[PDB]
Amino acid sequence: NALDCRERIEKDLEDLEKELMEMKSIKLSDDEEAVVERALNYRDDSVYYLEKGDHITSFGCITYAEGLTDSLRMLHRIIEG
């Protein structure tokens, strides 16, 4: 499956990075900041497994991180302020 090929994972990582920076652009609670930190840990893990050639684990890590991050984004409508 092309979902876990190198180029797709790389682009997933780039997109996650932008999303994390986006969430860092607003005030988050300490608990939400802990979610961000966990997402960053899983980003780092995704990169590790990609670099070791384990695309399935890498893909799992990035999608988990995307879930963590997308939840935060959904809890903060951009028109919330």
Residues of the shown chain interacting with ligand IUM in the complex, contacts defined by CB under 6 A = 6-7, 10, 16, 19, 66, 69-70
Residue closest to ligand IUM, measured at CB: 66
Place of tokens 């180029």: 7
DSSP conformation class of 2: G
- Closest by Cα among 69, 24, 25, 73 to 43: 69
Shortest CB 66 distance to a second copy, Å = 6
- Residue 77: strand, helix, or coil: coil
Binding site for a second copy (CB under 8 A): 1-4, 29, 31-32, 34-35, 38-39, 42, 54, 56-57, 59-61, 63-72, 74-77, 80
